[PDB]
Ligand binder design. Structure first.
Ligand code: HEM
Ligand SMILES: *[C@@H]1O[C@H](CO)[C@@H](O[C@@H]2O[C@H](CO)[C@@H](O)[C@H](O)[C@H]2NC(C)=O)[C@H](O)[C@H]1NC(C)=O
Ligand SMILES: *[C@@H]1O[C@H](CO)[C@@H](O)[C@H](O)[C@H]1NC(C)=O
Ligand SMILES: *[C@@H]1O[C@H](CO)[C@@H](O)[C@H](O)[C@H]1NC(C)=O
Ligand SMILES: *[C@@H]1O[C@H](CO)[C@@H](O)[C@H](O)[C@H]1NC(C)=O
Ligand SMILES: [Ca+2]
Ligand SMILES: [K+]
Ligand SMILES: [K+]
Ligand SMILES: [Zn+2]
Length: 595
């Protein structure tokens, strides 16, 4: 039996098929298979799921059951031994701005989201997990190893809930557990507009026929818009400062307020949509709000597509860019547009690019007041520092003039993320992203490192000397072998990130292959790809080729000096030009005359 039966919690719809606009859900992109790429379906499997019991139990569940006759090391143990480091001196990427890091998380959030199992909506199951560290059902807690400082200070574990899976009521037959992607697999600005019709409607300005996205009515950034507040309570953004009591933002994506630079980016994108809609109302005063919303949405979509493929991927993939993403040859309806389970771990390379501090800079790119530089951990679920402390302009200057962290085999993930992460359900700056990433690899039935090396046509190291040669690093290979005993058991997230970077890139070979193939598919398999003939006119495409992140800032802030190349390391003033010398988006080719 072959089964494409099971996928229950989804909006059902007849496909228009002649619409010039994407659906919100991602449905109807592929005409032969309308649900391919749509939200709230299984992540694609490039390799079959690997579970302790072949169905659903992750490796490390049953203390006793081995992986290939070896115990899997505790997620927190791998983190402590390998992923941690003390000295932030010298850690920064000398040719990547903070914008590099930040764009990664933006693209990631557009493509995939595997939300944790709910069921704990006013729940004692939450209690049995957080308080008593009791493994069972969806509680798969991260146990602290012996000697862990957090033993003395937090408890025996970090609580952890397993990712949502298709059929919370399956098809009754007997298959491996498959995690849901709650967002559209297409690069379509879903993190702005929503992947769900109901939310997408609530986000819109339906009071005026002007195709605008709803803006905050309680607060402004010197006349420029903020996202509306999420009024769902209790609010983690209120909790981190109950005096200020500034809630999280309401965005097309649940995660928009996770950290202040991500919230900033979401603000930049919402502003660009409203500016697009107003400029298109000027050109085409006969266009209704629906037409305005879709045409702006359609441009903003291509903008993300263009920045990602022209500016971002080449400086991630380096020498491997052309190998995996050759020049476009048009829409191929046989290409799987869906995001793979493994992709959602490969792209978490970004967690090694986040540095320990965030700066606010003034109009001369100097420290903005006495508390300019803040530790990252103070900025998780932090909206009050935007609303109540200078708006987004000072944070955007930091995005341009400050640097991403470089991935370092000895300095992988800053303590701000490894020890002081805040989760929106919980009350402590006490969680470990690197431990959560390793736990999540097991939750999702990820094959091992050598499985993936194999998939990518790379040598599979089986011995100490073998791993040393792949990693070009004797000590890291050793620490790995002592923890995992065989490279076969190395969880894909630490495995891929352990590899030294390709020439001119910021990931190693295994990650370049996994990311390369996914981005080749998200392009080739996308009927509404901006370069697909008929999606835009040839002239609209000439206009679009001129977009830049620098211009988005010029058009949606009060910053007047910006670099030409916003992703490379730029110092003020040598590398900054006045905004008037930056190419604009010419919207004249969107003019629509009935005569
Ligand atoms: C301060 C910066 C960042 C924070 C605080 C952060 C935090 C998180 C958290 C809490 C998760 C969920 C982990 C789980 O339950 O499995 C996550 C997932 C993920 N992150 Fe990050 N992250 C950051 C930056 C980045 C960057 C720069 C990228 C890529 C360049 C990235 C890519 C991902 C991906 C792919 C996932 C899995 C899907 C998802 O985003 O939910 N993250 N991140
Ligand atoms: C929806 O759109 C309307 C019209 O563009 C917005 O109303 C304007 O808001 C600005 C700033 O608050 C005022 O200076 C204008 O005078 C307003 N016009 C009217 C007719 O009131 C409105 O705020 C938008 N709604 C939301 C929730 O974003
Ligand atoms: C930074 O990297 C970009 C990547 O394309 C390159 O164009 C630029 O010349 C590099 N500058 C350096 C290493 O100083
Ligand atoms: C909370 O915000 C107020 C301003 O609203 C500020 O003066 C204070 O330092 C903040 N407290 C914390 C805990 O961040
Ligand atoms: C389209 O993709 C399929 C599946 O990857 C491949 O076999 C085929 O050769 C491609 N067709 C064209 C015209 O590129
Ligand atoms: Ca999407
Ligand atoms: K997979
Ligand atoms: K994320
Ligand atoms: Zn201003």
């Amino acid at each position: 039996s072959w089964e494409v039966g099971c996928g229950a919690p989804v909006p059902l719809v007849k496909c228009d098929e002649n619409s010039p606009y994407r659906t919100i859900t991602g449905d109807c992109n592929n005409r032969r298979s309308p649900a391919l790429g749509a939200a709230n379906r299984a992540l694609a499997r490039w390799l079959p799921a690997e579970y302790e019991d072949g169905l659903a139990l992750p490796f490390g569940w049953t203390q006793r059951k081995t992986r290939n006759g070896f115990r899997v090391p505790l997620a927190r143990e791998v983190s402590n031994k390998i992923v941690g480091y003390l000295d932030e001196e010298g850690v920064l990427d000398q040719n990547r701005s903070l914008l590099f890091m930040q764009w990664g998380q933006i693209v990631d959030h557009d493509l995939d989201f595997a939300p944790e199992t709910e069921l704990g909506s006013n729940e004692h199951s939450k209690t049995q997990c957080e308080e008593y560290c009791i493994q069972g059902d969806n509680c798969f807690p991260i146990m602290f190893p012996k000697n862990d400082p957090k033993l003395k200070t937090q408890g025996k574990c970090m609580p952890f809930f397993r990712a949502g899976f298709v059929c919370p009521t399956p098809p009754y037959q007997s298959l491996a557990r498959e995690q849901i992607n709650a967002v559209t697999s297409f690069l379509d600005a879903s993190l702005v507009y929503g992947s769900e019709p109901s939310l997408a409607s609530r986000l819109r300005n339906l009071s005026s026929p002007l195709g605008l996205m709803a803006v905050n009515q309680e607060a402004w950034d010197h006349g420029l818009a903020y996202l509306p507040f999420n009024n769902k309570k209790p609010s983690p953004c209120e909790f981190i400062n109950t005096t200020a009591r500034v809630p999280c933002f309401l965005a097309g994506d649940f995660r928009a307020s996770e950290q202040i630079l991500l919230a900033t980016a979401h603000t930049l994108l919402l502003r660009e949509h409203n500016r697009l809609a107003r400029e298109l109302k000027k050109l085409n005063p006969h266009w209704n709000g629906e037409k305005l919303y879709q045409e702006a949405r359609k441009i903003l979509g291509a903008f993300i597509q263009i920045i990602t493929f022209r500016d971002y991927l080449p400086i991630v993939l380096g020498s491997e860019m052309q190998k995996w993403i050759p020049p476009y040859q048009g829409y191929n309806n046989s290409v799987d547009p869906r995001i793979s389970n493994v992709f959602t771990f490969a792209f978490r390379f970004g967690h090694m690019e986040v540095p320990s501090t965030v700066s606010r800079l003034d109009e001369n790119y100097q420290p903005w007041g006495p508390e300019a530089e803040l530790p990252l951990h103070t900025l998780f679920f932090n909206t009050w520092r935007i609303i109540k402390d200078g708006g987004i302009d000072p944070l955007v200057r930091g995005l341009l003039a400050k640097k991403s962290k470089l991935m370092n085999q000895d300095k992988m993930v800053t303590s701000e993320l490894r020890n002081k992460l805040f989760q929106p359900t919980h009350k402590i700056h006490g969680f470990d992203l690197a431990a959560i990433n390793l736990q999540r690899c097991r939750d999702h039935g990820m094959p091992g490192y050598n499985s993936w090396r194999g998939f990518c046509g790379l040598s599979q190291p089986k011995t100490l000397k073998g791993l040393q040669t792949v990693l070009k690093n004797k000590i890291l290979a050793k620490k790995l072998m002592d923890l995992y005993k065989t490279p076969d058991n190395i969880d894909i997230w630490i495995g891929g990130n352990a590899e030294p970077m390709v020439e001119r890139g910021r990931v190693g070979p295994l990650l370049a292959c996994l990311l390369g193939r996914q981005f080749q598919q998200i392009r080739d398999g996308d009927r509404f790809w901006w370069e697909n003939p008929g999606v835009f006119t040839e002239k609209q495409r000439d206009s679009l080729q001129k977009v830049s992140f620098s211009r988005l800032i010029c058009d949606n802030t009060h910053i007047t000096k910006v670099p030409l190349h916003a992703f490379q390391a730029n110092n003020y003033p040598h590398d900054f030009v006045d905004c008037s010398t930056v190419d604009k988006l010419d919207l004249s080719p969107w003019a629509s005359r009935e005569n």
